Swiss-Prot record, chains B, D:
GO terms for cellular component: cytosol. This is 2-dehydro-3-deoxyphosphooctonate aldolase. Keywords: Cytoplasm, Lipopolysaccharide biosynthesis, Transferase. Belongs to the KdsA family. Gene3D superfamilies: Aldolase class I. It catalyses: D-arabinose 5-phosphate + phosphoenolpyruvate + H2O = 3-deoxy-alpha-D-manno-2-octulosonate-8-phosphate + phosphate. One of its GO terms (molecular function) is 3-deoxy-8-phosphooctulonate synthase activity. It comes from Aquifex aeolicus (strain VF5). Pathway: Carbohydrate biosynthesis; 3-deoxy-D-manno-octulosonate biosynthesis; 3-deoxy-D-manno-octulosonate from D-ribulose 5-phosphate: step 2/3; Bacterial outer membrane biogenesis; lipopolysaccharide biosynthesis. It is an enzyme of class 2 (transferase).
Amino acid sequence: KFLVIAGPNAIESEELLLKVGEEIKRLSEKFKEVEFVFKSSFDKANRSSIHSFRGHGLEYGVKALRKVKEEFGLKITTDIHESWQAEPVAEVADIIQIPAFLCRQTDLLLAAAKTGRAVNVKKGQFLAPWDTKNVVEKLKFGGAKEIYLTERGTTFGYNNLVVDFRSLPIMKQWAKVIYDATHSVQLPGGMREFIFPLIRAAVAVGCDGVFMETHPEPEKALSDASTQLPLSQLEGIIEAILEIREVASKYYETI
Amino acid sequence: EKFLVIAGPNAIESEELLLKVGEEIKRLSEKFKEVEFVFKSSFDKANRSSIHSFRGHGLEYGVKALRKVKEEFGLKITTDIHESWQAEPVAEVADIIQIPAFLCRQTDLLLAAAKTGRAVNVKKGQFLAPWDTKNVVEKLKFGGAKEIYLTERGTTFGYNNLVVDFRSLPIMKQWAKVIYDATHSVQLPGGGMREFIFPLIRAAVAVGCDGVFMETHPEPEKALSDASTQLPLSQLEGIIEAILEIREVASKYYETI
Amino acid sequence: KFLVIAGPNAIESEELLLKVGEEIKRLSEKFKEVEFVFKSSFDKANRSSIHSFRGHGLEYGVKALRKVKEEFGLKITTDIHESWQAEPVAEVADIIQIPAFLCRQTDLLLAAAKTGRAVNVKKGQFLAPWDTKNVVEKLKFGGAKEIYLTERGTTFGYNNLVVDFRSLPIMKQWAKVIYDATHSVQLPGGMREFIFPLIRAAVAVGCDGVFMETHPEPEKALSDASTQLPLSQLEGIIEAILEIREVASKYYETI
Amino acid sequence: EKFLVIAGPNAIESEELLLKVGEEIKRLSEKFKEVEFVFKSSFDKANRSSIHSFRGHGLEYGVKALRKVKEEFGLKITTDIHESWQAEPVAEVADIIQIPAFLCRQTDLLLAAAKTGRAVNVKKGQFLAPWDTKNVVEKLKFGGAKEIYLTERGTTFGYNNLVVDFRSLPIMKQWAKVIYDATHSVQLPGGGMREFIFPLIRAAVAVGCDGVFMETHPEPEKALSDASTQLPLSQLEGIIEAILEIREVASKYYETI
């Protein structure tokens, strides 16, 4: 079924996760035609500034995510940054996420694959669609069976990203494809106004799921504040993508 | 608002070719009554990469052929101009005067088109940012244009490749009606990939635009221009139906500019 | 000999041309190892805004340029925008310049070639280095014998240009190569601070000439005010490029 | 200031290979006394495109081989780290700790390198704008780094291609010493063109930088990595002489930051 990966960008507090998990749980019951996966990072290991919010550590993060899964029965996904983290994270994460800048780090991919969990690799901003074939091959060699590739924009000049929708059908040749509606519109070093329009494009073109960050009060977010979606708007967007997918899917090209 | 579909053979290979495509466009205009069809074909390919490539049979021949399409089928017409002097003669038959992408900044060409009283559709240059088109529209309005369109046809992305930044659709909608060129957007400059034409057109309509531009030919493989990207005429009907369906379902979500 | 194409961006007045022509004439006498060509546009036919300075017309422009050639004995170059202009412009222009946006307009190139004058084509911001082979072929077909290709930057994301110096040796395979030090640093829709550094790069890599716009008071320029070089700084930069070329030329690769 | 030349085989194919290149670098360091040579070689290629490509013989073997180069030739050493835990062991032999381009934003890796007390050279990510490196240097200074270098190695330009924006040299010089990577800048990601190595290095020195990074191998065609871009060892001397000459003549024109 269609995958919807959503949650607050960073684990600002297990409290925040619970509030967002509650809504995601509700939508989960309302849209049985969708597989929801709760996402949140225990650490922002690649911030531009040394003075920016990183998180409360792996232990606190895995604990809070464990709370969400136990209290709501929702699948979990979070990203790892160094090989040693794969094992402890796999204790709770159904899907281990690989950061865009780290999509070429062989040991991180192999460590993720070794856990037996599904792996979702964020496509590096420096990678071409066809360059992802090798990424999948690494994961398969490592024993991974459920593999996702996420479109999150490509470097387009300085401090800007562009989404080449041709990437969706190309990557689909070797993995399930997810469209990251949040990071794709962020200006490195974004505009929330383009989030919905581009997500409509993604489903019209055809993808296996959508990744969207949501926060009760985006303005107060300690990360991706400019692009996280207000929690209250999540339901409407999900319904919209299901409606567009229902009609457009008739035209999705084979493989 | 009535959706615009600009379609036809890239170049006026012959008047017969035009009539063949025109006949089909006419049939479709009778079926898709909610669509405003505009027949397109260039009387001259003034910017071919090679001096040895097909250009056309001249303005005179071309205008005459386009006039025949309009007369025999009652279809609106659009063709592009390359130098200021062509605006007047072309305006005699063209309902919409098209401004080539490489020439979108040529002031006199825009002014020549605007003073004819005809609608003007400017292909967004491969070097232009979405917000840079505001001044393009301003020039046209200054010149008397009352019906203006901006066409998205890809942006320079490295060498011999174009990318379509769909954020351009809502941005340009701020000052003009927006058309998505499904054919040129997937071509590889000086290198096109037909397999991406349909998916990207689906994207355009889901994001929201005021029309689509698609070149079609009875036998693309034999086209004298854009042979790699022109759509087989028999596939036009299905593509149009598909975009109307996606447009309908996505429409309630189109943001207000 | 090494070509130096310099002058004010636009023909703001024949007076301005005379003042700049005087200095260029002086440098002309001081640097006999260089072929100076006076440049200035009789019309800015591609301004972004309808309210920006365009010029005083072709007649006034050709007249002022004619004055420079007669009063200083300097070669002339100006750009054309429509085919009909080639003939009248050729009356004074030793080198007919083809605008970057118009580098693919067959009739403009042929009209320029038909005059018998040399032709310098500004490489479009949308063109790849190897794509210029066809541009030269058009000009040769049209009868042109002296052909130049000018590097002036390539579209790099939005409102920015990048100079891929690999273009110099590539274009050299089929034409003489000129480096436009002024437009290459301008931000479409620039930074004078990068003009000198990039011109040093151009000569270290190897080119047949440099194109530089200069104005007595750049701040008062009605065009390219942000990138035109103060007249007083021209001598120093020319001497610098000659010195760097003298040393570096030993390493310029063959063809 | 003494010009830095970082050179050596891309990967530690064997200790013997290192000694062969080291011997030549040593000879050159005796001739070009105004140059500070630093021997470079990766103990691991942790980011190969393919799982089937050569990676290396491990950290232990690599550090031991690099230590042999330093001991036998008295040359400074630099190698790159891929995860935080490698900083300490590598710092035992490396005078300059290199941070991979894809990892230039990984805070812990930068911090791990900085606390060793060794110099740190960060390859500028292909996704980073020149001004975005200010925060990279800030992170290092925060971590205790006192000797920091930023290496220009190209920027993503479309697919499978990199472009070198030389404006980056003067911009980055505002907060760190700048090195130009003549080898990786001409490689075609997931596609390199050796014919552009020398011309672009000439450009770098004419613009002005504090050093150059060039990979060299006795027989590039047989290299287990970067076979298309590593310079034949016999050509190193001539290239170094050329850059010193161009640097000298261009030096009086270098702008003050």
